[PDB]
Ligand binder design. Structure first.
Ligand SMILES: Nc1ncnc2c1ncn2[C@@H]1O[C@H](COP(=O)(O)OP(=O)(O)NP(=O)(O)O)[C@@H](O)[C@H]1O
Ligand SMILES: Nc1ncnc2c1ncn2[C@@H]1O[C@H](COP(=O)(O)OP(=O)(O)NP(=O)(O)O)[C@@H](O)[C@H]1O
Lengths: 195, 176, 62, 168, 681, 163, 73
């Protein structure tokens, strides 16, 4: 809806990031010297709301955690607070908080200090408007050109997803197998009835 | 020597014959977007040889000016440089395309690919290696290749790819 | 939660707490299936979810 | 006979490769105009190098040792330019063709790159670049504008310009 | 595992709760504090266990029981004092940090009550001293973790600082209380100036009466207090003036009189002068506008030149003190390392097979203290970000304050690496400490000093290779390929190390490299075939590799079948050729025959270790199937006879080359043994 | 119902795309055609600077033109049904000053619905912004905070040194 | 927009002699290198904007310009 602000601790090069003056609604441009670490900001923002980034192997996952000096952290965590004033997101608050604690063997989403099941949240964001697996509307440095030299089918899938017609498709094809199996079961039932 | 100047004809949005000016020691090719400047490099990669798939166009027939729009201009094309080296002589390489095939010229005399190639190999450029050209987005993909392709390049430059069949034939025989 | 179709919600999202006593006689299929078609402001996403729910229910009964 | 052919491939491959490795280390050290950068070009399975990977690890100018993928593009392209220049410096090559390498580099890095290009350009190789930032063709001495023309299709033409009657 | 850890710690908690005065309490505390940083669940449980076992509000009644708990904590710390304090400090970080919110503040009250009650116990002590110094040390640790807890009593701690004795534990009191003062003085709420005056006075009085380390650790506190509150730097300016003048007078007198007698009289003044100028220039930079009070004359260059002069001399201790001074000079201005003379000096002292054995230890100590101090300064300077951040540019991106620590290393590393191969042990211990402390900050490229860092695992002393191997597994777990890249050079360097020094030493690397099937086949096939068939490898090297191969634990079935298969093939061809050429026809024959026979005996000993029929082995073929030979090889107990057999055949070799007629008879017997080997089924 | 939604949404996105692309480029036109069917793909037919003779295919284009196609599509699909937030990384490398001015004007008008974060090395993109930020990287850790427009507009081009 | 302001600058620089012939060599006789290159590229973008037609015969010589359709007058 409207990303108010973000809080980061120990992710990649943000050791401890306390509160920052909130964003505006219209246009907030970030600039910075070469190598400062501004793309990693967006990597955080997408590491939370998009599942695809956190699909790499453990070696990279260990690489993901920041390791500069002193002790070595093991539990990094990123929190985001944004406002669903339009109640686009259903659970009514004025400043929604969601955090994703990351550990070598730990992966947790805390929505107002109450535990979740890692699937309800995916269905939540999908039903809200997000798309957990789509690279679209997040554009990394260098992959804009590929949207044009992509084969047509990729764009057809993209627009079809834009229409919001993926879950229906997946659930129907999944259901067909189970129903067919019930058809066989009904055949068995009739056999036993005749006996 | 060095790269004095080149010559275009009908190739990829360059109608007619015009002479690219003499090159100084270190030049640059500026111009606003969509003007069609990459295609001079395409020309350079076509005189010195590059597989057609790398020329960012299918089928090699939309090479002629105005073909991808829908209407060709002729049934020829002619791109040619003039290499100038020490000794006060001047060489004129060429390469014209007919039908599907392509014919090469040395000193305005039709030649076959192999001898032309061997002349370049004397000059010091391994066209199959592709170690000195960088297109629009490949400067990143120089680094992030899988190591095998880099080994392939290093094996290509070093004249050690010809000795392959010899090697594994000997390998199979000795293991047997 | 709350509503006369919450069972189909549960069968479409969690489905595990659904006991044989629930599935057995709580829901008369032929009415809810009719209910799905004309309800105002039904999301297509929710429609597919509810489809999965009721079909799984039918499978359990079978 | 197997020993003979293995000696052949090994001898050529190793000679060229070691020369390239030492030269890439020095070239990168020179290129960053600092003195805390490293670049190591190392083979695997050093008994039969010609059939295995040849890996590449470079250090940033001022940070820790990280895997190559993690490092940003801005350093990545400087690494690639170094590797290219090394490859050329082993066995000479009459020219380059650089096409919009300043995709992600800041102005300061391109300026340093330009200083290297200019000091190297005189007596070693001719270099032709296509770019947009004027800070890369400012060290140049002659410019080549290329312009299109509206028509049934876009027909383009070329025109030159001299730059060696000007101050600094 | 993670189960077993929880169960054993539960048992330990019940032990330490139920029947105290058991002897092994202290060690239990040591082990539990050792495991604080290992995991997450274990962390939570140890945190709550320690929160209920000691740090409980302990209401103000039955003080004797409270004192007994105090005795418990003091005993624990005083016994773990030998190894290190890192785990305890980490635990203290955890307990304090873990409650930053209000949350009734349960621990803050209890901890402050522990420190004040320890103060009170110290008060009534009045006059076992091991317990005294241990308590002061505990005070020191508790100050280091957080300083607010010991703000009120420092003025009462002052009398101990004034005067003390000439015994060790007392010296420990002096250094620790100086450390406490260093830690606490800036935060002290509005101190009294005469208190500072007498502090500085007796600090000087202590400097002029005691040993090296205490002088160091107190002038540290002097620098801190002068740089935080007072301004009377004319005092330290005059002290440095006297010492500077003194050393210049000694230098001038020595420059043309290398035979004078004043050195044998004024030795203490000279030694103390070197140590003092080092420490003084280190901790508190007096090369500025007001210290001199006029235009700078580059005193740093002066002291550098004078020490560099005094490097070439006839004693040794003088050299040690001068190099220590040079290191202290370095700790403030890193750029000084760049100078040609210091560079060439270090790279000459460390190499060229120098006589001294104290210089190398001192060099490594210099690097270690440089690394630690730079790391800590960077970290605690990160700690206070917001107050000074806003007044530095965005367009600058400084490097000379950051990159330096890498570049410096690049001048010594290789040599330091070479310094691993020294016959003494202390040099090795500190060298390994230096390199493995270095690498964990990524300063240098890992894979050029990996083989040596692996081969250093075949030393006698356990802690050495323990630290080494643990460091190596940390190097490996991130980056898959690295160790697999350099393996044969590893064992070769290991063998060179062993032949410089004089079971299953190499087993750890072998277990590590067992994950990848192709890599596993690769390194083994390369090493085994290259060494045996055509290369004149050292017989001792062959013995080393053979013993290592036999010792190797095997957890699958692919390995013995693969190795047996290839050895057989090469054995067949080579041996056949050998026997026909000897019968058709010679010390060269003796050597190569010794090689081939040892490899034969390896094959036979292996076959005895498995007791498998040659038919089953020959049935196996390379790449038959992934899953067919999946059985774990059973091992008969105590059949490790490879050492014994190799000693037997080594005696058969007898370490005798081309001397006597009798060895020729032995050579003929050896050929007969080959015929017997052929005869054997 | 799904088939009906497909039809209507294809119509809306096609029309909006024609609108945006005609607005961005000063002269030209482009459209989205369906393929043979059930459906199998969506092709795009673009033309400019001849306006009748040009009828393009994809492989022969420029960086700027391809990037314009993609950004136009993004703006269009937003103008159909807005998305939560857009963050742009190094989009501006390909285009020229004329195109960059155009895209900035479209951002300035289109701003009032959704949030925009973006990066760059060129000044023009901050022709239309409320409040900026900054990113400082010292002592091997990275920080981020707000700055003012003056130092940003100065830093972006005016200096060409090592600091 | 600095560019169209400079375009009006071009109009006023042309409106002084009226001989419809802007020479390049003269226009760059007394400038520094960077701004000269900037002005040259400005000539290029002007040719893009169809408001001007330019002519050059030899490889290295001045360019001769004349106003075209969209001069905006
Ligand atoms: N986990 C990490 N710990 C420390 N440094 C890191 C980490 N991840 C990345 N970096 C460094 O952070 C720097 C900034 O990375 P990145 O954010 O990708 O830069 P960028 O903004 O994309 N560069 P550019 O596109 O040229 O503007 C790089 O030099 C990385 O090596
Ligand atoms: N044979 C041809 N005849 C005419 N036009 C062509 C031909 N081939 C391609 N074109 C078009 O002419 C332009 C040339 O494209 P291209 O050479 O890639 O330009 P570019 O140099 O990359 N442009 P830019 O980087 O923005 O300055 C494109 O619009 C092509 O679609």
């Amino acid at each position: 809806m409207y990303i108010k602000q973000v809080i980061i601790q120990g992710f990649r090069s943000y050791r401890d990031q306390t509160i920052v003056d909130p964003f505006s609604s219209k246009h907030n441009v970030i600039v910075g010297r070469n190598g400062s670490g501004k793309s990693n900001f967006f990597y955080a923002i997408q590491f939370v709301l998009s599942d695809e980034f956190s699909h790499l192997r453990p070696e990279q996952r260990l690489a993901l955690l920041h390791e500069g000096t002193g002790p070595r952290v093991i539990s990094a965590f990123v929190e985001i607070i944004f406002d669903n004033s339009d109640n686009r997101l259903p659970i009514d608050k004025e400043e929604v908080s969601l955090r994703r604690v990351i550990g070598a063997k730990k992966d947790q989403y805390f929505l107002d200090k109450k535990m979740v099941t890692k699937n309800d949240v995916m269905n939540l964001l999908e039903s809200a408007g997000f798309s957990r697996s789509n690279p679209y509307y997040i554009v990394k440095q260098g992959k804009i050109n590929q949207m044009a030299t992509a084969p047509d089918s990729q764009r057809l899938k993209l627009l079809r997803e834009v229409a919001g017609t993926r879950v229906y498709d997946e659930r129907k094809e999944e259901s067909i197998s189970l129903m067919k199996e019930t058809e066989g079961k009904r055949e068995k039932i009739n056999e036993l009835l005749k006996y | 020597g060095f790269l004095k100047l080149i010559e275009i004809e009908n190739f990829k949005s360059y109608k007619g014959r015009q002479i690219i000016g003499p090159f100084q020691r270190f030049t640059a090719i500026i111009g606003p977007n969509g003007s069609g400047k990459s295609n001079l490099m395409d020309a350079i990669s076509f005189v010195l040889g590059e597989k057609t798939s790398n020329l960012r166009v299918k089928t090699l027939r939309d090479l002629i000016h105005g073909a991808p729009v829908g209407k060709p201009a002729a049934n020829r094309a002619f791109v040619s440089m003039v290499y100038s080296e020490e000794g006060a002589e001047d060489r004129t390489f060429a390469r014209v395309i007919v039908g599907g095939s392509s014919e090469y010229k040395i000193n305005n005399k039709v030649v076959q690919l192999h001898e032309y190639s061997e002349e370049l190999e004397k000059l010091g450029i391994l066209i199959k290696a592709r170690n000195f050209l960088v297109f629009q987005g490949a400067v990143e993909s120089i680094a992030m290749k899988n190591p095998k392709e880099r080994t392939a390049l290093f094996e290509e430059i070093s004249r050690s790819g010809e000795l392959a069949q010899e090697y594994d034939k000997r390998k199979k025989e000795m293991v047997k | 939660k709350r509503g006369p179709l919450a069972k189909i919600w549960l069968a479409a999202h969690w489905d595990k707490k659904l006991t044989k006593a629930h599935v057995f006689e709580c829901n008369l299929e032929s009415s809810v299936e009719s209910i799905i078609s004309p309800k105002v402001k039904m999301a297509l996403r929710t429609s597919g979810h509810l489809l999965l729910g009721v079909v799984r229910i039918y499978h359990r009964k079978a | 006979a197997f020993e003979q052919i293995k000696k052949e491939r090994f001898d050529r491959f190793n000679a060229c490769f070691e020369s390239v490795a030492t030269n890439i280390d020095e070239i990168y050290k020179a290129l960053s105009r600092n003195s805390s950068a490293q670049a190591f070009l190392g083979p695997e399975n050093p008994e039969e190098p010609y059939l295995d990977g040849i890996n590449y690890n470079c250090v940033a100018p001022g940070k820790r040792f990280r895997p190559m993928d993690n490092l940003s593009g801005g350093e990545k392209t400087v690494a690639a330019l170094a590797l290219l220049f090394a490859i050329h410096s082993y066995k000479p090559a009459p020219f380059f063709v650089l096409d919009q390498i300043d995709a992600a580099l800041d102005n300061t890095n391109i300026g340093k790159v330009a200083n290297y290009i200019k000091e190297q350009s005189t007596c070693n190789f001719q270099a032709i670049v296509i770019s947009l930032k004027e800070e890369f063709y400012t060290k140049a001495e002659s410019l080549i504008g290329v312009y299109p023309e509206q028509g049934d299709c876009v027909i383009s033409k070329v025109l030159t310009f001299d730059l060696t009657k000007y101050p600094d | 595992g993670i189960s077993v850890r929880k169960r054993v710690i539960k048992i330990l908690r019940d032990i330490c709760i139920e029947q105290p005065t058991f002897p092994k309490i202290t060690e239990m505390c040591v082990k539990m504090i050792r495991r604080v940083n290992d995991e997450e669940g274990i962390k939570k449980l140890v945190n709550e266990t320690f929160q209920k076992l000691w740090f409980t509000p302990t209401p103000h009644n039955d003080k004797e029981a409270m004192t007994r708990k105090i005795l418990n904590i003091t005993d624990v710390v005083a016994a773990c004092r030998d190894t290190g304090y890192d785990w305890f400090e980490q635990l203290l970080q955890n307990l304090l940090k873990s409650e930053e919110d209000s949350s009734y503040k349960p621990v803050k009250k209890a901890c402050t009550q522990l420190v004040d009650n320890l103060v009170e116990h110290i008060l009534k002590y009045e006059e076992n001293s091991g317990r005294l110094v241990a308590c002061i040390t505990t005070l020191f640790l508790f100050s280091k973790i957080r300083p607010q807890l010991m703000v009120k009593h420092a003025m009462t701690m002052q009398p101990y600082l004034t005067t003390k004795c000439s015994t060790q534990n007392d010296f420990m009191v002096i250094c620790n209380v100086a450390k406490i003062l260093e830690l606490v003085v800036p935060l002290m709420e509005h101190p009294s100036e005469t208190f500072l005056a007498t502090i500085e006075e007796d600090l000087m009085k202590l400097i002029i009466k005691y040993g090296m380390t205490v002088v160091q650790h107190c002038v540290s506190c002097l620098g801190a207090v002068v740089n935080k509150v007072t301004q009377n730097f004319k005092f330290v300016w005059a002290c440095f003036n006297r010492y500077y003048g003194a050393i210049s007078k000694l230098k001038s007198q020595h420059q043309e009189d290398p035979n004078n007698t004043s050195l044998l009289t004024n030795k203490p003044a000279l030694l103390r002068s070197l140590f003092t100028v080092g420490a003084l220039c280190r901790h508190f930079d007096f090369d500025l506008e007001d210290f001199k009070g006029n235009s700078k004359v580059n005193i740093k260059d002066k002291v550098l030149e004078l020490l560099m002069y005094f490097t070439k001399h006839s004693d040794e201790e003088v050299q040690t003190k001068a190099i220590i001074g040079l290191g202290f000079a370095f700790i403030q201005h890193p750029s000084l390392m760049f100078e040609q003379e210091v560079k060439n000096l270090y790279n000459n002292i460390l190499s060229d097979k120098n006589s001294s054995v104290n210089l190398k230890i001192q060099v490594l100590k210099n690097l270690q203290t440089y690394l630690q101090e730079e790391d800590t300064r960077m970290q605690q300077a990160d700690r206070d970000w917001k107050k000074v951040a806003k007044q530095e540019d965005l367009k600058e991106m400084g490097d000379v304050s950051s990159g330096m620590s890498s570049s410096i290393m690049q001048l010594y590393l290789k040599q330091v690496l070479e310094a691993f191969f020294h016959t003494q042990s202390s040099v090795r211990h500190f060298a390994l400490n230096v390199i493995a402390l270095t690498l964990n900050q990524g300063l240098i490229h890992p894979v050029q000093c990996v083989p040596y860092l692996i081969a250093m695992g075949t030393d006698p002393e356990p802690a050495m290779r323990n630290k080494a191997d643990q460091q190596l597994v940390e190097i490996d777990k991130k980056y898959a390929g690295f160790i697999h890249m350099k393996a044969v050079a590893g064992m070769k360097m290991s063998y060179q190390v062993q032949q410089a020094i004089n079971s299953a030493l190499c087993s750890h690397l072998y277990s590590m490299i067992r994950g990848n099937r192709q890599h596993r086949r690769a390194f083994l096939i390369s090493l085994l075939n290259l060494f045996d068939d055509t290369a004149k490898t050292d017989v001792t090297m062959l013995l080393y590799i053979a013993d290592n191969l036999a010792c190797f634990p095997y957890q699958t079935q692919e390995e013995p079948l693969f190795i047996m298969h290839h050895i057989d093939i090469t054995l067949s061809v080579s041996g056949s050729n050998l026997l026909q050429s000897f019968k058709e026809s010679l010390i060269e024959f003796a050597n190569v025959s010794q090689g081939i026979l040892l490899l034969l005996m390896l094959k036979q000993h292996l076959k005895n270790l498995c007791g498998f029929s040659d038919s089953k082995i020959q049935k196996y073929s390379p790449s038959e199937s992934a899953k067919v030979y999946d059985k774990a090889i059973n091992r008969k107990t105590g059949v490790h006879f490879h050492p014994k057999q190799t000693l037997d055949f080594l005696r058969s070799d007898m370490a005798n080359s081309k001397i006597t007629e009798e060895v020729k008879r032995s050579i003929v017997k050896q050929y007969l043994d080959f015929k017997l080997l052929m005869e054997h089924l | 119902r799904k088939y009906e939604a497909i039809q209507l949404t294809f119509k809306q996105v096609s029309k909006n795309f024609s609108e945006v692309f005609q607005k961005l480029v000063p002269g030209g036109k482009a459209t989205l055609v369906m393929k043979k069917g059930q459906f199998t793909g969506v092709g795009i037919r673009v033309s400019f600077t001849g306006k009748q003779g040009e009828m393009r295919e994809m492989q022969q284009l420029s960086g700027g033109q391809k990037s314009l196609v993609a950004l136009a599509l993004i703006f269009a699909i937003q103008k159909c049904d807005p998305a939560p937030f857009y963050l742009f990384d190094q989009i501006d490398q390909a285009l020229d000053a004329q195109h960059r001015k155009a895209v900035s004007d479209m951002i300035m008008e289109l701003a009032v619905h959704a949030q925009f974060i973006t990066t760059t090395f060129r000044p023009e993109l901050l022709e239309s912004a409320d409040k900026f930020y900054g990113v400082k990287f010292r002592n091997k850790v990275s920080h981020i905070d707000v700055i003012t427009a003056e130092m940003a507009k100065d830093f972006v081009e005016d200096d060409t040194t090592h600091g | 927009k600095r560019t169209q302001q400079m375009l009006h600058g071009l109009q006023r620089a042309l409106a002084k002699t009226g001989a419809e012939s802007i020479s390049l060599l003269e226009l760059c006789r007394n400038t520094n290198r960077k701004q000269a290159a900037a002005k040259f590229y400005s000539f290029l973008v002007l040719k893009k904007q169809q408001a001007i037609e330019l002519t050059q015969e030899e490889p290295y010589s001045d360019i001769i310009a004349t106003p075209g359709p969209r001069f905006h007058i």
